[PDB]
Design an enzyme around this catalytic site. Sequence first.
Site, PDB file in Angstrom:
ATOM      1  N   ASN C 149      19.621  -0.293  27.246  1.00  0.00           N
ATOM      2  CA  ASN C 149      19.022  -1.479  27.874  1.00  0.00           C
ATOM      3  C   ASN C 149      19.916  -2.731  27.888  1.00  0.00           C
ATOM      4  O   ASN C 149      19.997  -3.435  28.900  1.00  0.00           O
ATOM      5  CB  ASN C 149      17.698  -1.818  27.193  1.00  0.00           C
ATOM      6  CG  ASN C 149      17.886  -2.257  25.754  1.00  0.00           C
ATOM      7  OD1 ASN C 149      18.646  -1.644  25.004  1.00  0.00           O
ATOM      8  ND2 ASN C 149      17.229  -3.340  25.378  1.00  0.00           N
ATOM      9  N   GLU C 247      17.914  -0.778  13.853  1.00  0.00           N
ATOM     10  CA  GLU C 247      17.159  -1.700  14.694  1.00  0.00           C
ATOM     11  C   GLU C 247      16.325  -0.863  15.646  1.00  0.00           C
ATOM     12  O   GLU C 247      16.851  -0.286  16.603  1.00  0.00           O
ATOM     13  CB  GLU C 247      18.080  -2.649  15.465  1.00  0.00           C
ATOM     14  CG  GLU C 247      17.378  -3.930  16.017  1.00  0.00           C
ATOM     15  CD  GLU C 247      16.646  -3.743  17.356  1.00  0.00           C
ATOM     16  OE1 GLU C 247      17.261  -3.966  18.416  1.00  0.00           O
ATOM     17  OE2 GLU C 247      15.448  -3.407  17.357  1.00  0.00           O
ATOM     18  N   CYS C 281      13.930  -4.874  23.262  1.00  0.00           N
ATOM     19  CA  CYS C 281      13.384  -4.524  21.964  1.00  0.00           C
ATOM     20  C   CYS C 281      12.409  -5.619  21.508  1.00  0.00           C
ATOM     21  O   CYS C 281      11.392  -5.351  20.853  1.00  0.00           O
ATOM     22  CB  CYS C 281      14.508  -4.332  20.924  1.00  0.00           C
ATOM     23  SG  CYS C 281      15.812  -5.585  20.994  1.00  0.00           S
TER      24      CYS C 281
END
Lengths: 484, 487, 484, 483
Positions: C149, C247, C281
């Site tokens: 992304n 993450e 995210c």
Amino acid sequence: MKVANYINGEFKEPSTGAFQVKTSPVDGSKIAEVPRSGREDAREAIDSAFEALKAWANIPAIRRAEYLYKMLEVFRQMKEDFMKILTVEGGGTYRKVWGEVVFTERLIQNAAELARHYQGRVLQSDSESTISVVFKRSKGVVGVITPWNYPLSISMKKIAHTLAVGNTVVYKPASDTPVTGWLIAQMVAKAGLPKGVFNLVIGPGPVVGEEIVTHKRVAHVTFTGESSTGREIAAKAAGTLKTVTLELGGSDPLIILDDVDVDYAARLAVFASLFHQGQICTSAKRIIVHKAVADKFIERYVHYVKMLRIDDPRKDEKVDLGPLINERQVALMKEFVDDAVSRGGRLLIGGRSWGNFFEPAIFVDVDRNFRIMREEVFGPVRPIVVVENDDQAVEVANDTDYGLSGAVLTNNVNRAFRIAEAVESGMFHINDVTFLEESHVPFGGIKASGVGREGGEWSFHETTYDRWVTVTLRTRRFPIPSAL
Amino acid sequence: LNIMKVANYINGEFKEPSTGAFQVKTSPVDGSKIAEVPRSGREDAREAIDSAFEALKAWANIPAIRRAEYLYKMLEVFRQMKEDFMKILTVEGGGTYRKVWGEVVFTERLIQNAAELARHYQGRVLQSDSESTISVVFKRSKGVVGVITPWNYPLSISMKKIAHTLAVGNTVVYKPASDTPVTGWLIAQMVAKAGLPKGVFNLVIGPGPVVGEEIVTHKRVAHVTFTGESSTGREIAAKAAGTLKTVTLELGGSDPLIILDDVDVDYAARLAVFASLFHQGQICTSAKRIIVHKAVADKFIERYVHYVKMLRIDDPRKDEKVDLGPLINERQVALMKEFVDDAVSRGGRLLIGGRSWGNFFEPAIFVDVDRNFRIMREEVFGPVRPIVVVENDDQAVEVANDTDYGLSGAVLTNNVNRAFRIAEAVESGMFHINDVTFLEESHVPFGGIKASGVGREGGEWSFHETTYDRWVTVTLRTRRFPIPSAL
Amino acid sequence: MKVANYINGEFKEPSTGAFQVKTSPVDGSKIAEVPRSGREDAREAIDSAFEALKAWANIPAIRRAEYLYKMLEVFRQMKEDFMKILTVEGGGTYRKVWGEVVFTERLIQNAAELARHYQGRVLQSDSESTISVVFKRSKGVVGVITPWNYPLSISMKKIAHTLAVGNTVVYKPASDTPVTGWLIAQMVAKAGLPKGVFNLVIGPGPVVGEEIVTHKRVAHVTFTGESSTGREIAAKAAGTLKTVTLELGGSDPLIILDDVDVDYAARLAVFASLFHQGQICTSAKRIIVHKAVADKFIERYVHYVKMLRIDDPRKDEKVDLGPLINERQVALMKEFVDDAVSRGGRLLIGGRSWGNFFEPAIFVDVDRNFRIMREEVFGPVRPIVVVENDDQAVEVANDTDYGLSGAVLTNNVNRAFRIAEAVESGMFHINDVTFLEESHVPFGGIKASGVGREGGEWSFHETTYDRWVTVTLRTRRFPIPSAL
Amino acid sequence: KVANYINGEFKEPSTGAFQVKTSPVDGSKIAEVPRSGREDAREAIDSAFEALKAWANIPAIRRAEYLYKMLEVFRQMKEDFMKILTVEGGGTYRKVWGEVVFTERLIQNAAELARHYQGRVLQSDSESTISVVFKRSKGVVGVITPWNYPLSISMKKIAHTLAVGNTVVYKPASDTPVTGWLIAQMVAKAGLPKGVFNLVIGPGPVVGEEIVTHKRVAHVTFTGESSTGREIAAKAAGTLKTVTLELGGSDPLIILDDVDVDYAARLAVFASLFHQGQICTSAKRIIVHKAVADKFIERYVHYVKMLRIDDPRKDEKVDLGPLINERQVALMKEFVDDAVSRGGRLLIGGRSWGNFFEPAIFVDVDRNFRIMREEVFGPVRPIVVVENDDQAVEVANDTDYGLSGAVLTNNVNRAFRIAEAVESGMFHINDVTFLEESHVPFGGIKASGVGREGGEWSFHETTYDRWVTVTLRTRRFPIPSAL
């Protein structure tokens, strides 16, 4: 060549037009005409700095860092000009001025690197429902007042870092090195810093400097120079409660123990004691050697001192020593030699002088009453003292009003650490020169060598204050009126 | 005191001043005699300094954990002496039971705090730009530290300085305010009973311009930490220069309490009464200039005055509920009378109060003031308080900053943007949103800017003031040197 | 296009020679041939990074900084190529890929700035005659595994900081963004980093990734990707006791209170919830609005959503939204819309999809059992939830497995802080978007959102260890043998 | 009478199952103890989860007060603790006195530091933005410990984890359950809020694994064998909880030719053999320079011969006690036999009687010996003779482990070069390998584990950083662009 002040974004003459001709220490040839500025000029610079302060302090750190990265790029293009002036104005050899310029590049880069990263603290509150934090804020207008020996690197360490954390600057260089200062202002101007953020005023310390130290709109003064000057500055600063950073003289010991490579120790001692004609705050000014190697050390040291080549520093890149900055320095060195001879010192080598040049004079048979043991000898006169053991080494090392740097040469880890611990100085180095210096370490002394530390974040500590701020999230009852 | 004489404490022993000279300390409450106390001179200060100097290396060189143990012993002794400290704070200093209770509780936390942190004051390991080089930074104690203190919070102020300075390896020469000598002697009692090594802590009771100046000008003193008037501070800082000793200066304050239009006005008034008049306004961080938004000013002023009316002024020994005691002496009463007379003379409106009797002085509240009033231009170290009405936050800030001082300050508001903007623009060393101006914790950086002084005290910040950084390197490889170039 | 692995200083094809064709998410057209590397390729990269380690770890930090500054200069020249590929291979619009490239420049510069200033500690010893300090040491070979992304910025944040502090790198980009990974290799190659310090292997995660995670000579893996993938990597990493930074996903709450500027709050929410098609995210994936402004908020939010321009991101610079990365994402969003409709959700707008393009689908009347409230919706489907008070806002905000970022809009300082405090997340922003990110702050989550922090010195904390070292200066007696 | 401590209450396990703890000295029964199952552990975990928010949200000063109370109680219980460390654990007076003194310092340390764990205020790259970082506790913390230094190791993890606002579920080693009980007693007597601290006594693969795999447990701090550590780390992954792992060591003690050889032998005996060598940072591999190797070996063996092995309860001057169990003796016997078989020269010792093992010292070994390849958690020690410092370092690093290390030398250059090249989490110049202070970062690299414990490094392990911002201006956003 005519040189000017730099005030509020503009190069301009002093308001009186007064000027002075500056000459080279090398041969007395004329160098430039420079301002002889007065109080009104300093006040104008301070006022400009003050009016530029809020805008400079309140932009994000990253923007100040960008200006500094720009100043770095401008510096890289001006390196040759700086080297040229450090030699002809300041007397430095090629190797000296090359080293100063490399370090100065590193100092500007270091200030830029660090600007975004100076942090405050989040605290535990002893109270319920309380946020407790500590901000860093810039002090305000900062006076920068500098000496003549390393005029570029000392000035820039102060200027770059002070600017980084959002202070504005009023800068007054040493009267023997005003051209270097004017070049700094040229660099800053080409970097495009907002008007008033940096200002140059060229004039006498007792007039322009004192105006800076006593002005109410100046928040802090960072100063490098003689202890006596520092003490006067500190006293004068009290009237407005401005803080100070003071990097004053040194009389650093270099201690050589009996387990060393004696030849290497002598090479190291020669560089440490006599680089830039010993005109370094952290020069090894008192050499202290263990009796078991003293004879060989002294022979070897003198042997290498004899190899030193004293010449017009403009001549080529291999000159070892140039001239002292002026005739007063030569006159003082002669007083030191005269004192040592009169007290029974043995002059092993040197002492010849012509014009501003001086051949390193090396004494043995000295005692603690010699002026070259009791005073900072900012020049190429050096005593060697022989000691019987490490206790005496330490006793001799600490028998001074000064406390800047110092060094021990030994292979023994216990002797190295014990001596390092016991020697009273702001800095210390095991197996290296006394004048080691990096851009981001705390540089400064104790005792008569001053107060405060400069270099990277320590420079930031000096020109910022902590600000405790709290948020209380719940109401409570108060003890008065008790009737409630 | 019924069984003991008040004396100096020098190198492990309670001594008379060398001249034998003394003077009688009386209570501000009723003029009654409290005790004879020393009136020392330069000789006694010198002896204390030499004692502190000779104790220095042994005290600095022991492990931190050893110094912390002594401070923990002091803490234990303090807990035993709490009633004696409260009693003396009241009768000698004029503090109410609630005031001296608070001071004694805070002092306990201060001693404990210094003990907690002694072992944990860290240096730095650095990256070297050179190869084969270890590069580190040690913390070293400064040496003999002079401690010179005021009369308003003489216990907590003295002990913040004393406990923290000792924790990190310094020795101490302590000279208390002449109006609070018995508090200083009780501190000495405490240290003596904790068995600190002789010379590590020394107490000299005598005149500031004699004993204090000797401490400030002596060459074996490395640092002075000082709390008092800004003029006194400028004097000390200049005297300090002669020997290049460093100073910590906590000076006057004229703190702004800013009240915006979106507050609980009643809560604001209660907060403001406490902030501005606790300990008769004799607090460095007292809310000395109250600044209220015009949209709530009328109700605020009414409310504020309503609660001020309720304040009970009395002999602070009477009971635990007395709100205000007396001022410390008659000079203070005379000075407050001047502040009041000046404000009235300049056309100020006295809303309430103004009577005095002996050392007692009532809160005196003004409105309709301008920037030329003495009570807007000077620190008013007593219960005389201006209220200034302003039209917006810009004027709130302009007025807040229109002072030579810069200690603390506060804003009351529920609006996050207004709170933060005002906090950022007010020129002070400390600042508090929705709380009193004199918030103080044992481990926060306490101190001001502008005329309010230099340095920070509290926890590690006290340690920063009385230690120095020491850069040390080890170079593991030989190299060639640039001179002589022929080599 | 000539896309290849970068191993030990050389661009080369995978050992087997296997390639695969990358097509554009925008229109399915061919983009490039890329490697399909195997375990042998990963092992060769690892061995190279391992052989390179000591030389890279043991130079001065200033030397590593220099390489990073050089990388910065190269990156500045490659900007247009990075923006191009991010759009064409990643589907990013102009403004998105612009932001990413601007942030990448700052990430690289940040890593360079900090390299020299990562400090250890000097301690007080409880023993006499003891020197006690703590050094910082690099962990070693670090595996870097990244998603599709924000492939550039996410990868450079990990790579630049990891290298800065003396680790060497094996990097495996997302299979859907392999060209960006390759361009990164280009930049590093041109920057002239020593061979083996940085290595790129383009291959599938369960093959090349798992080899990196399980290899004995890899010291650490820093990973960004789905929480499920993260849980797997963490278990595979356990074999060789390598540490990990994880993450993982987010389902961040954006909480709008009743005292806000409702039109502004709507504008903010649209940006925060749907920028890059909500494939972030820290996208605002769960919008929580106070009942007193809900109706006006929902109206205004839907209004600005309807104004969003979806198009080929290559066409012009004002395209608001591009395609989703592939068909599976479209299919997954359909599932999300299916479930929501199925459970009584009110579809206010959107849901239309063609190829990889998808119109933001906005729901109201949801409850906690909707998939779009229970799972991370990595795409343009967003629930708005109405709450009656602050307690409810917090309860809904925390009713998720995730805990990455979060935001509250209000002008009330007590409500903002109480909510900031109560929301369970690694990060939180008052009066701003959920995906606020700076180069030097601790970025990361709690709960299912992962472990560790990245950015500036927090990245350094992840890829170094503390090393306690002492020197004792005096001998002493020991307790055994007691008879002695 | 020994039981679990769950939610403020001392109670028997759910199933009522118990087992007998025996002394390693003579097999004497010490106490009956819980043999808990997954439900006693679930119960402790839920208790801690429910006590958590109240415990984490009080000001640090109040937690510090509770720890200072714990310290006051501990000082009262010092004798009780020593007695049990000896009879249950096998430690000599000198060992257990040391452990108790150190534990006292550990509890005081955590208390001292609770109020001073700081976050950061940052410069924002954006205008009108406040940017700060808070410290927050991770939550419920699992504490699982070994049997060799059960008090100090437990209390280092427990005191510090508590200080900073976590709640604790503690499962001690099955061989030292009474010490864990005495800890619960200290905590109960200090009056901590119910559920803040919980003791569950039981088997590692039952009680321990439940803790490690439970969803409401945020962190596990573990000290034990490397293999166990790897198992724990893999299981921990499924709920993404973090771990601190202090695993085995095979620490090198390097002795150079310029030392005081006699002093070096004394230091080596203490470092290699204290607590019968049952120390993670024991000097497990002795590396000595050729030039002093003969006189070092002679002096070292001479002092080892002087070691008094006896019932540690007998008097205060006993040098060595027994190993913890019969199984440790059998393992050491394998270590000894393997070295003999491989050609090793046994200089002294090797005998064993009951649980008591006589220190066995070997020379002429090679890297294929078990006592060179494995952690030897007992009194069997190899001496390796080397020719130069390069060899010293190569041998030092030829291990899977990397906990601590030491070099003895008076030469500053050799000391620092060797310190830098040895691959270890910790290192000591001119001191024992097992130096340890309450506030320093303790832990290893390679197979010796991950993370650091001691003071603020403990705090780092059991807290996370939280970036929080306030933006004070509004701005325009880039979508929808038409706007």
